[PDB]
Design a protein around this ligand. Sequence first.
Ligand SMILES: *[C@@H]1O[C@H](CO)[C@@H](O[C@H]2O[C@H](CO)[C@@H](O[C@@H]3O[C@H](CO[C@H]4O[C@H](CO)[C@@H](O)[C@H](O)[C@@H]4O)[C@@H](O)[C@H](O)[C@@H]3O)[C@H](O)[C@H]2NC(C)=O)[C@H](O)[C@H]1NC(C)=O
Ligand SMILES: *[C@@H]1O[C@H](CO)[C@@H](O[C@H]2O[C@H](CO)[C@@H](O[C@@H]3O[C@H](CO[C@H]4O[C@H](CO)[C@@H](O)[C@H](O)[C@@H]4O)[C@@H](O)[C@H](O)[C@@H]3O)[C@H](O)[C@H]2NC(C)=O)[C@H](O)[C@H]1NC(C)=O
Ligand SMILES: *[C@@H]1O[C@H](CO)[C@@H](O[C@@H]2O[C@H](CO)[C@@H](O)[C@H](O)[C@H]2NC(C)=O)[C@H](O)[C@H]1NC(C)=O
Ligand SMILES: *[C@@H]1O[C@H](CO)[C@@H](O[C@@H]2O[C@H](CO)[C@@H](O)[C@H](O)[C@H]2NC(C)=O)[C@H](O)[C@H]1NC(C)=O
Ligand SMILES: N[C@H]1CN(C(=O)c2cnc3ccccc3n2)C[C@H]1C(=O)N1CCCC1
Ligand SMILES: N[C@H]1CN(C(=O)c2cnc3ccccc3n2)C[C@H]1C(=O)N1CCCC1
Ligand SMILES: *[C@@H]1O[C@H](CO)[C@@H](O)[C@H](O)[C@H]1NC(C)=O
Ligand SMILES: *[C@@H]1O[C@H](CO)[C@@H](O)[C@H](O)[C@H]1NC(C)=O
Ligand SMILES: *[C@@H]1O[C@H](CO)[C@@H](O)[C@H](O)[C@H]1NC(C)=O
Ligand SMILES: *[C@@H]1O[C@H](CO)[C@@H](O)[C@H](O)[C@H]1NC(C)=O
Ligand SMILES: *[C@@H]1O[C@H](CO)[C@@H](O)[C@H](O)[C@H]1NC(C)=O
Ligand SMILES: *[C@@H]1O[C@H](CO)[C@@H](O)[C@H](O)[C@H]1NC(C)=O
Ligand SMILES: *[C@@H]1O[C@H](CO)[C@@H](O)[C@H](O)[C@H]1NC(C)=O
Ligand SMILES: *[C@@H]1O[C@H](CO)[C@@H](O)[C@H](O)[C@H]1NC(C)=O
Lengths: 729, 729
Amino acid sequence: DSRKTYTLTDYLKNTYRLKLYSLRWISDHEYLYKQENNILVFNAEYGNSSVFLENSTFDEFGHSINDYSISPDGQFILLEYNYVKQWRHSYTASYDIYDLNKRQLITEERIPNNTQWVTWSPVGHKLAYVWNNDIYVKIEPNLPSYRITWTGKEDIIYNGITDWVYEEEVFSAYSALWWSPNGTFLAYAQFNDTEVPLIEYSFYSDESLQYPKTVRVPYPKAGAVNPTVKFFVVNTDSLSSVTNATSIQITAPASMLIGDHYLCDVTWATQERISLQWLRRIQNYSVMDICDYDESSGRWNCLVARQHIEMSTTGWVGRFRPSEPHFTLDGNSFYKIISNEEGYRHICYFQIDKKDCTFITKGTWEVIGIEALTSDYLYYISNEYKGMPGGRNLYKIQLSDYTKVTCLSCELNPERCQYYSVSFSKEAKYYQLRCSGPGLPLYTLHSSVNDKGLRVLEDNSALDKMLQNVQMPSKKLDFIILNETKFWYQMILPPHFDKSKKYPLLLDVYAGPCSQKADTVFRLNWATYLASTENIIVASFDGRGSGYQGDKIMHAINRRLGTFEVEDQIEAARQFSKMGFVDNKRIAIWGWSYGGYVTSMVLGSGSGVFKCGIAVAPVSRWEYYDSVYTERYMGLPTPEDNLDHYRNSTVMSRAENFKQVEYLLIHGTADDNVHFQQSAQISKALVDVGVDFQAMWYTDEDHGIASSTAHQHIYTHMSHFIKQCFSLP
Amino acid sequence: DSRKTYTLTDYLKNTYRLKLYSLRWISDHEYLYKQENNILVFNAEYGNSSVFLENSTFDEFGHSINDYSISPDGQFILLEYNYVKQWRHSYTASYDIYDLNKRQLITEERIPNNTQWVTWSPVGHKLAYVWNNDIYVKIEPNLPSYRITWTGKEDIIYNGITDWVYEEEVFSAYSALWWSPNGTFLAYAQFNDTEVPLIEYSFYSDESLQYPKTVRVPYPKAGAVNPTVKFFVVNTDSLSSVTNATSIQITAPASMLIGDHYLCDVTWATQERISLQWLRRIQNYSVMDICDYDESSGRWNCLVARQHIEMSTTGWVGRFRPSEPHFTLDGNSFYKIISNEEGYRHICYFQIDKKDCTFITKGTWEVIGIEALTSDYLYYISNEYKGMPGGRNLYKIQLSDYTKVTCLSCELNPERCQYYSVSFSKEAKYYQLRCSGPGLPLYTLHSSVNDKGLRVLEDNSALDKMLQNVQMPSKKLDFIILNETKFWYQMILPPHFDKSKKYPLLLDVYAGPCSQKADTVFRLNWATYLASTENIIVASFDGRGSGYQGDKIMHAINRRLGTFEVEDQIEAARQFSKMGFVDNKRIAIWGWSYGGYVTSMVLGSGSGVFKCGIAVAPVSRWEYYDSVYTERYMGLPTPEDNLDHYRNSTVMSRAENFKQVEYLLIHGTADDNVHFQQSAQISKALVDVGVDFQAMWYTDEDHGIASSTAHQHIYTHMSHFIKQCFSLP
Ligand SMILES: *[C@@H]1O[C@H](CO)[C@@H](O[C@H]2O[C@H](CO)[C@@H](O[C@@H]3O[C@H](CO[C@H]4O[C@H](CO)[C@@H](O)[C@H](O)[C@@H]4O)[C@@H](O)[C@H](O)[C@@H]3O)[C@H](O)[C@H]2NC(C)=O)[C@H](O)[C@H]1NC(C)=O
Ligand SMILES: *[C@@H]1O[C@H](CO)[C@@H](O[C@H]2O[C@H](CO)[C@@H](O[C@@H]3O[C@H](CO[C@H]4O[C@H](CO)[C@@H](O)[C@H](O)[C@@H]4O)[C@@H](O)[C@H](O)[C@@H]3O)[C@H](O)[C@H]2NC(C)=O)[C@H](O)[C@H]1NC(C)=O
Ligand SMILES: *[C@@H]1O[C@H](CO)[C@@H](O[C@@H]2O[C@H](CO)[C@@H](O)[C@H](O)[C@H]2NC(C)=O)[C@H](O)[C@H]1NC(C)=O
Ligand SMILES: *[C@@H]1O[C@H](CO)[C@@H](O[C@@H]2O[C@H](CO)[C@@H](O)[C@H](O)[C@H]2NC(C)=O)[C@H](O)[C@H]1NC(C)=O
Ligand SMILES: N[C@H]1CN(C(=O)c2cnc3ccccc3n2)C[C@H]1C(=O)N1CCCC1
Ligand SMILES: N[C@H]1CN(C(=O)c2cnc3ccccc3n2)C[C@H]1C(=O)N1CCCC1
Ligand SMILES: *[C@@H]1O[C@H](CO)[C@@H](O)[C@H](O)[C@H]1NC(C)=O
Ligand SMILES: *[C@@H]1O[C@H](CO)[C@@H](O)[C@H](O)[C@H]1NC(C)=O
Ligand SMILES: *[C@@H]1O[C@H](CO)[C@@H](O)[C@H](O)[C@H]1NC(C)=O
Ligand SMILES: *[C@@H]1O[C@H](CO)[C@@H](O)[C@H](O)[C@H]1NC(C)=O
Ligand SMILES: *[C@@H]1O[C@H](CO)[C@@H](O)[C@H](O)[C@H]1NC(C)=O
Ligand SMILES: *[C@@H]1O[C@H](CO)[C@@H](O)[C@H](O)[C@H]1NC(C)=O
Ligand SMILES: *[C@@H]1O[C@H](CO)[C@@H](O)[C@H](O)[C@H]1NC(C)=O
Ligand SMILES: *[C@@H]1O[C@H](CO)[C@@H](O)[C@H](O)[C@H]1NC(C)=O
């Protein structure tokens, strides 16, 4: 075989690209899509297309455009430029608006520079935006905006945007605003960061910056003072240019105010109904609150009877946060993924005035998401098929009979497609399926009415040709049985696999609570190269604590972080040499983030099983990470709660055992998420007991070391280390 | 040969110790010295000895003692405990005093905790001390102290102690107080740090510290706002417990106040005369000021006529700062090392009212220090002998005839002793010589009167026995001629040197202005091990910019830092392969601090001469280091001064050329001196142009990475890297 291999350059220089088919539905039958640099609008029934915005319409604007948003009446286009990243989701941009009819960009009362956030109303053309931490409402794209709040202060009070910890661990968003469907109301949370300690660190910046900057961020580490939250709603119809605006407080429920709480979900039900979810700072108790609007008063009442109590006896509420509720149009009921009696997460029918819910699904598998609700059907993604947790399909359930369920994706392309996800049009007339493994990604449009497939949207046939020229590796997905339970793993095997030759093995890891590293998705990444070019088995394994296989597995790690999930990776490595094609002198292990923490705990176990490891951005000690996440699993680090295991579980206490292995610690110096301090303490520990190891800092890089030059650099560096331990040229 | 070699453990575990003979003269014939843990007093004429303080006299004190100081009348002992390091010289301690006669430690009016500084008067038992940045005077060891100043503020105003930059680059001391010989006056400088930018960085501290501390320090980087200085004197006799104390300002001279200046020397002449030296922020102009005391007034006048103007046409004033003046007893004259017409530094006789000075020495060598002044003789250290800059001896000059000079150390032990230094008794009746190379360190006591040697004090005969058991390397000191000038080098050659075998070579470097790495001193260090055990030639070389060989050499680098001193190391390496015993495939290079900066510039030169280098704590760009030092050599970094070479001389601009070499960057994260930022920018540069290299951070370590565990760790790490590039097992 004389074909080239998938090289390190291929991945790094990014030579073989998966084509995507990213669309934005704008109606019930049309969607928007990008071809080169103009925007095409498409008809879902027929396929036909038209130019909407040319890739020269903003030649003369003298500012490079970053994104764009379309008002829910096709009338105006928002243009996002001057983009500046903050955290995972946050940023600041400048914005201009363009009247699509008059072909003209607005000049009077512009959206101010460095805006934190901006979102259209659901109907019409109302904007809202957050700038210097306060909410503003523009009724029409060119009249003066109404200031809704006046409390906004840098690092202290956030109005309608989340703070650091809320952004990352609760909302997965900078945005803290919710319009009502009508567009009449605006609900927003407000966050108070006054007593929250700051993390401080250096940003060295460009060579021209003579003095390094100290970045400071309110960041509550385990057991420290959390942000407080308050919630307000405002009638955007009764807005005066003389009176300030009357915001209306919705207090948390009685059973939340007696201690620290978090606001963890905001979903509108109907024009005059909003549901709120709250979580105790001990995250095993959650309360949902139906808050109805009152005419006579101009206040929002939350009747104590309407509260629905979601709690857990064996661990924490929700996968990461508690599930979203999905409301029937009238608003008197809703479905919501909940953990059942046996422990598996399923769909539950809630009627808004009664206590009990009815389970409309069941069995030893879990529901991933609810995706669409019609009169007749609920559409959901699940891993039911072939009893494979790793897999993802799409199902519909007959509201008239919970027994009648059709699979809609299982049998569509079975050898190529075992992992689906979906986007539905505005009222669910069509749905794009996106398959993303085990074959090359496939994108197809469908019609809800009869479940007819219309056309294939992108098949990666161009990429498929190319890959035939290349000694591509394959993926084995399988399971191994420990303690009478089934745990799943994946191996990326090198091409021309000879099962009687002994191969060196890299165990890729994350293993954070409820994660999944053994799946049916097709990836082109570092592992491929180590399989194609270097002939290394790169295997991943989902052990206790892992996701999508019921609470009995996921909750095994409760308050015991850094125990079973670690232990398990070790036994996983053991069974891999038992299989006979593994060189038990050349087993390595590596991970990023949480994975870097498990990586280090493993090397630090003295199990003689691993020759070397790499840890990128590792958690090193749970009291160093954020409170919301850390506590969710570990409790509080106080002598009465879980201080003792908080101590029994540091990388540092395991320093002496590293004498037996080769270790490469990597960390970005600007890591706001897992602070450089986490590693700074792993290394000091190592130094102190006389252990040699390799380090690499990455200056100004954050948690994802995303910078193009840094990325290439790290995967280069990592590769050398890897080959070196394995004796390859 | 079956003898063991000098191993890495030997150096690290510190197996073969040089014995020292450290004494403190306390009179004209007695000195103090430590045997185990008691203090012995000695007679210089006869050798006899007595216990002074037993190593059990402070068993019952319940506090471990760090040092001790003896009042200039043998009456009380100061005891320094609770020692806490700050910078190179600064610290804070607790202090107790012990009445030696009554055998009792004082309890009323104790010296307060966290004292910055404390120093006895020259006669009697007056203390002065600095605590929370203010001067206090205790007249007797147990009456309430008098507060001299009230302006003291953390980080802002320093009374009688220096600030960061003054400590390091000007006074080489925390102490900023000077008693008059009588003990009547107290002069002190006061430093104002108000507009000085701060360097900020993280200190991660013990594992128990959940949030990393930000250390902030006023530190003026090149061209930034410097501290201002003011100078005061106080009559400690007229001190009232009702009136505050009247300090008396001595303003700098007219020709200093018109711009930024530094106070760079304070020497008392007689009971009522103090000399002050000042330096322009452009350090090529210095002015000394004779300030006489006035009876009638109670003020100090500095007559403009008495000023002595030291300046330079070819570079900067002084070696690092301008030389100390040494006063004849009456006070009307003094000697002072000055750079002569030809460029060599020599002794000059100054009479306090006339302009010209007379040179009392001359020739193509330099004076290192003045050491003693009597009626009849001036005692000085110089490198005159054998025309060897590397060497150090002791000379005396007949005040009655500048022609009659005797060498006093040259011919004392010639095969073993080429590098001397001295400590004289109170009125110069005796002097301990300390030789420290090329043989094992030797310590001998002498009598001034006739230059009789009395006895040998320590010869390291115990160490000498041991070393015979070991395959010790030798040192070749020699010179090579470039551009018709003589430049000196040293090679540590491995044992059983075969001059027809080709050896791998490590070029050790510092090469900062006026340094000396090629000398006759006997060291037992990392180089030895690389010579004894690994058979590597470790050679050092003093090129342009280097010290002790006249201004023509030292001033060659003026405003051209990072040019000739770099270029020269390269040509030094060239001539080393020309010699025939050097493997020109295995030449490496390394240095610390400045040396790390030259190291990096060299690897970054694309000269194909070096295979690999190590840089520890490197300067990376001159605008990142402190102003006083940086400007002394480079000027100001402004478009009109020397901004252009300030730019032409960064490591970063040389990033692409590193593709051709192996590089190990090391830095301590708590480096107050050369900030972590210096390397943080070398690495970011490297990342950016796709170059692979090895890094190691050292958390909480400072510029000397002195921590026991860190030390061992770095020299371990460094060793692996070294062997790896050289292909050794
Ligand atoms: C996909 O391709 C589609 C078919 O070409 C196309 O649908 C329409 O295209 C154009 C523009 O949208 C339509 O022309 C316009 O139609 C309206 C309505 O016309 C009807 O009504 C009038 C009066 O009531 C009658 O006199 C006519 O005979 C007709 O029935 C007109 O008012 C406009 O002036 C204009 O003529 C066209 O009718 C639509 N086609 C059909 C037959 O459905 C989409 O635009 C294409 N979509 C994309 C994604 O580009
Ligand atoms: C080194 O060894 C030295 C010799 O032993 C020693 O010098 C002296 O030792 C002791 C203690 O310091 C002295 O004893 C004391 O001496 C004084 C002076 O004595 C003279 O004067 C009186 C009256 O004027 C006469 O009556 C005497 O005869 C004598 O001449 C006495 O006042 C004390 O009470 C006491 O007796 C001794 O005299 C010194 N020795 C000599 C002869 O020089 C050092 O102490 C030793 N030093 C060290 C480093 O330990
Ligand atoms: C956002 O920032 C820019 C720059 O500060 C502003 O752009 C200027 O706009 C004026 C008036 O239209 C122009 O004449 C200039 O050409 C622009 N300045 C620049 C960048 O050179 C803009 O006004 C700001 N927008 C808002 C709403 O604050
Ligand atoms: C310096 O610090 C220590 C501790 O704060 C002080 O020592 C205490 O002294 C009192 C009275 O003598 C004792 O009873 C205690 O035993 C000591 N405390 C401790 C360390 O346990 C001391 O007084 C301080 N000195 C000054 C001058 O401020
Ligand atoms: N913040 C942790 C969670 N993350 C997620 O990507 C994630 C996944 N599912 C969510 C569901 C709901 C809300 C938030 C969610 N966040 C990143 C993790 C992370 O960076 N570290 C660093 C060390 C330990 C884990
Ligand atoms: N501060 C620099 C000077 N030093 C000395 O050790 C020294 C030598 N002779 C002196 C004479 C008078 C006053 C002060 C003196 N200081 C350390 C150097 C140093 O750390 N770096 C870091 C990067 C560049 C140089
Ligand atoms: C939207 O619905 C709300 C219900 O509160 C109603 O009061 C409002 O007038 C409606 N606005 C429109 C015109 O859609
Ligand atoms: C935020 O919280 C603190 C209480 O910790 C309070 O004193 C402060 O006024 C609050 N700020 C606002 C405006 O909500
Ligand atoms: C609204 O509130 C702001 C801040 O409290 C205040 O400055 C302003 O006067 C108010 N506006 C009016 C006109 O009521
Ligand atoms: C939630 O967790 C706490 C932690 O100690 C525990 O005491 C309690 O049993 C749990 N509460 C509920 C309501 O399940
Ligand atoms: C010391 O000398 C000074 C000269 O100013 C004199 O005034 C003072 O009284 C002297 N003190 C003693 C007793 O030594
Ligand atoms: C120090 O300097 C500043 C001038 O930069 C001055 O305003 C301040 O008062 C001074 N502090 C003292 C007490 O000398
Ligand atoms: C001395 O000065 C300090 C600070 O200016 C002041 O507080 C004190 O009153 C003064 N002492 C006396 C008693 O004159
Ligand atoms: C000192 O250096 C400056 C720097 O530009 C130079 O202009 C001048 O010639 C020198 N001054 C003296 C007095 O030598």
